Design a protein around this ligand. Structure first.
Ligand SMILES: C[C@@H]1CCO[C@H]2Cn3cc(C(=O)NCc4ccc(F)cc4F)c(=O)c(O)c3C(=O)N12
Ligand SMILES: C[C@@H]1CCO[C@H]2Cn3cc(C(=O)NCc4ccc(F)cc4F)c(=O)c(O)c3C(=O)N12
Ligand SMILES: [Mg+2]
Ligand SMILES: [Mg+2]
Ligand SMILES: [Mg+2]
Ligand SMILES: [Mg+2]
Ligand SMILES: [Zn+2]
Ligand SMILES: [Zn+2]
Lengths: 261, 47, 66, 242, 261, 47, 66, 242
DNA sequence: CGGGAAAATCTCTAGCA
DNA sequence: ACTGCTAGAGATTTTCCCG
DNA sequence: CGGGAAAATCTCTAGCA
DNA sequence: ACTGCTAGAGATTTTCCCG
């Protein structure tokens, strides 16, 4: 193909033909045309077609500031449950973001806050408020609201509820608290038919209960397992399969070729 | 080694190639002219 | 003693996702919980899921109902 | 199913509650509820307390969950009805507040607070609040120097009280207690819902007279007839709605 | 449920709870809660989750004006094939839109032009140019570029090619014509591995050939069919099934219970 | 008869109910206070 | 005469879509063409498709290839 | 497959072309191509013509597809090399232009037109154009009063000439003819591509000597050996690349 | 019939004011 | 009475090719 | 085991600066 | 070394309920 490849690069340097066009016009295998395209800097113009998956641990909260009727609404959400907190604040300022964050951390177990890189969240005053409550700050890739998919989706549900109840309140702060109430306790569905309030209660109570239960289980159930290796620490057994943790690496092995001691 | 072309931040012009330092699920860390950047995998191609 | 504790830890439902599927997988059975990983049973299959991709609840509503 | 008689015996012996029978013997909660409700010899989480403390010339408005000692407080600009109603709408949006106890003070008997309680569905009624005010004041005095304004200090005190101070029988903090109590009320409400759903169904088994329905299992149907719990196969009983 | 329904509307008038929340809180069948929500005007806030399908007949073209480097580019596309025409024009004016449209209609069989409701397309000067060439104008639902999905998608491919070849031309008009060339003849793929040029040639030649062939087939094959009715005109027969057109209504009937005369 | 609530044109506020005059595949024609409008089916609910 | 014409009309490939599926259905066999509708055969199934949802080609490449 | 001998006979009788054999007997085009190429006694669509007419003080620049009579023209502000090269880049983007014939005029031998032809891949060479100029001028004179500017009239004339005037053997217009001719060239190019693809393969059947490959069917493999076309089952022949 | 490699299909994304 | 689409990138299933 | 109705799941969308 | 999501609307498959 030496004559077919040299003419294809000469054509790609002009028209930037994709791999197919150069496979048809110069009698090339698909691999060679794809290679000629892959080596052109001017043709690498498209990312891969996937989406990530945000952290949904029980202690992660996403915060963001949204705007409505000239006012600033600082909104938070519990990612695992959908439970939201919100407040109209006079200004997007690290002072009042820190006040909001301290109130939140005082009402619920907030382990980690995920936010974008707005100035109020990247402020030295929030860093002090998050350090005092023992909160971990995760900032997202700048200019990527998809990294805040949960709270950004909650900026739409919250604003949608406010317009439904806006005419039952003179001020916007009352409508914001009405919308918080309605979302958290009057909208059911999701992973348990719950509302956001029931679901956060379940998530948190389940976290506590499971931590206590598994603490007891590990305190009692103390075995070592040899498979195929070292004395891996036993995690679970039953149904013809054993789960163990060998050097901080959890893997599933069948009951055969594994002995518990 | 891998070449990474990316779309950094509010800019339509694709940049690259940059060295791939770390591939996570959803985002990558790259090095482009002694500048370390974190680009989501929607905005980057790795070759 | 221990067996009651294990059958209690297996009463919690787990909702999880895989690393490239955006849809949430239905309620599995929690076998073991850890700091970074949970071990579940979904349709006679034993999967290990990171803690950040799993939602563990009890369903105070199917309990109270059998 | 098979343990219903054992549960009846354990109640007639120890007067246990339905949660234990349902946990120990493995019975649907409705059956154990009926077991505990068949003996006449065997016969809160939505109540908060509101008040206002004064400190350093500002007004702190504190709310306590009586069942758990959990505290919600914040400094307000004026001891008025607007800010009290706003505080109460906030709290009602955060936790399921069914009742609030107040001290008939002017800000609490206002039309705005009454209208907020009406909208949220809160029932207004006119010494734990005092002891918790004392504890909050002690914590505030402790942590005051770590902040410049008073509202920040009040929120640090609320954080400390709710999550850092532990005690009681099991050594849990107010946050864990409030979460557990609310989960228990969620279980209670779900059980009441299921009982109310099934109570409008009558069962004709083997045909014998109509009976109250308790559970519609996958391989059985549990019924209560003449104050006696019996098990019948699904194909041997017909359930109608009345 | 008379007491359960009256309390549910009283609650919906305040919080606007969805059908599930009112089914759980007031012991309602899903139909009744869904009815209570369906009767509330303030809750009808979301359309249905589908997309339409544009016309892709051989004679339909979608036109649009896109902007680049302060200049106006009037772009057209043959919907069935993807073949594009483009031109940098000094102004979005019905005069030059009509000139572009007349040139197009002179180079290809343009039966119908689909555009949005920009002033240059809704101009009385284009109406005269489309009337003279015998073109039919279809305007889209205002403020819905999805009705121009094809040409809007072509506004992105065209602009994408221009940046790839912009540095081989001093002026933008040269880069626009280079991009037209490259798209139409140097990018292969689609419903036949074709380029846009090959595909428009195939579409148009196939239209002519099939019209002629079916004209001959109908001129020769002249039968009437009775099934189950009137003498339906025969369209096709074979493989144990007959296709006929009874009173301008094409339906497929099996060979059984059908006689050809 | 059918009630149709819709989102007409560059306006976020949903309007309705309007009489359904014609249901096509992808768009509907409605009548809202002696005003005939054509709304896509992404922007309308019919009850 | 007529049979050559019919086997010629059936040599054209048809790409079409259904009224609620956004994906294009692979090459069928054109049986009859009309002003408003085309009649095709896709996997031993006879479908009637509107003219506005169908693309009819020959595939000059597969012809020239058998 | 079975008609290869009939096609060989029909060529030795009537000297037909491969298109007919492939259509009449039902043979892959490559086999009929080889049939027509085995007889030594049996042995344009990308060429356009450019020129400039002058009318009413403006310069019209006309392009004719020689094979079809199809015309592309437009009024340009100046008879220069920039506008000629722009016209030619436009045309090359619209139709597959492989060669353009011009009249060595100053605007056509410029460096800009040469560079445009180089980029587009057009070969420059220096009486149909005259007759078509006459016909375009006649049509323009006909339709002139229906417009105010001359460029609009020129485009109306181009529309009329390409799609409204019909003639020739079958009564087709220039548009249908150009489309048919380009489709024929597309078929020819696809056939040349497939022949070039298969010509670097050798077949060993039944083992006999290597043979040229023609077609790799689903139930057969067609080969040409010693100027004779034979059919062999796929399992009876092995194809290698050389 | 059985793996491996290559080809075809499938899935999913940004950008198009 | 009108209407999302297109092309590329990675993943996964089909087909083919020699044993 | 067989239909019908009701419930559960699936698919897909706008909006979130 | 980090990451789209949420809730609603219509369609389609499952489950259940009495024969
Ligand atoms: C003044 C005319 C008449 C009235 O409306 C405006 C505004 N407009 C807006 C876009 C635009 O929003 N493209 C983004 C996009 C969004 C969704 C989708 F499916 C396809 C898409 F291309 C156009 O392309 C466009 O031509 C116009 C226009 O022409 N006008
Ligand atoms: C000044 C800070 C810091 C730097 O960036 C700006 C700009 N920005 C833009 C959006 C926004 O584009 N939402 C639409 C959207 C698009 C895609 C998606 F997945 C989710 C979405 F919500 C925000 O929500 C937001 O908070 C900000 C913001 O805060 N800032
Ligand atoms: Mg933000
Ligand atoms: Mg935001
Ligand atoms: Mg437009
Ligand atoms: Mg546009
Ligand atoms: Zn390139
Ligand atoms: Zn409502």
């Amino acid at each position: 193909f030496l004559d077919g490849i040299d003419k294809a690069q000469e054509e790609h340097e002009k028209y930037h033909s994709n791999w197919r066009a150069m496979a048809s016009d110069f009698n090339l295998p698909p691999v060679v045309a794809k290679e000629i395209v892959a080596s052109c800097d001017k043709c690498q113009l498209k990312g891969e077609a996937m989406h990530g998956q945000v952290d949904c641990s029980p202690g992660i909260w996403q915060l963001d500031c949204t705007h409505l009727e000239g006012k600033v609404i600082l909104v938070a959400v519990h990612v695992a449950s959908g439970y939201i907190e919100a407040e109209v604040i006079p200004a997007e300022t690290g002072q009042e973001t820190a006040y909001f964050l301290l109130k939140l951390a005082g009402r619920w177990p907030v382990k980690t806050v995920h936010t974008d890189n707005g100035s109020n969240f990247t402020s030295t005053t929030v860093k002090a408020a998050c350090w005092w409550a023992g909160i971990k700050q995760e900032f997202g890739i700048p200019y990527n609201p998809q990294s805040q998919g949960v709270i950004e989706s909650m900026n739409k549900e919250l604003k949608k509820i406010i317009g439904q109840v806006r005419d039952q309140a003179e001020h916007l702060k009352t409508a914001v608290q009405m919308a918080v109430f309605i979302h958290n306790f009057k909208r059911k569905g999701g992973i348990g038919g719950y509302s956001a309030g029931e679901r956060i209660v379940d998530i948190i109570a389940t976290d506590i209960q499971t931590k206590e239960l598994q603490k007891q289980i590990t305190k009692i159930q103390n075995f070592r397992v040899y498979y195929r290796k070292g004395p891996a620490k036993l995690l679970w057994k039953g149904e013809g399969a054993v789960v163990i943790q060998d050097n901080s690496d959890i893997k599933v092995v069948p009951r055969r070729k594994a002995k518990i001691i | 080694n891998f070449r990474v072309y990316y779309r950094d931040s509010r800019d339509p012009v694709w940049k690259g190639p940059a060295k791939l330092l770390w591939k996570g699920e959803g985002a990558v860390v790259i090095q482009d002219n002694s500048d370390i950047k974190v680009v989501p995998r929607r905005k980057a191609k790795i070759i | 003693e221990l067996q009651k504790q294990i059958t209690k830890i297996q009463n919690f439902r787990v909702y999880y996702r895989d690393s490239r599927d955006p849809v949430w997988k239905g309620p599995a059975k929690l076998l073991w919980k850890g700091e970074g990983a949970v071990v579940i049973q979904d349709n006679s299959d034993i999967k290990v899921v990171p803690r950040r991709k799993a939602k563990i609840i009890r369903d105070y509503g199917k309990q109270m109902a059998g």
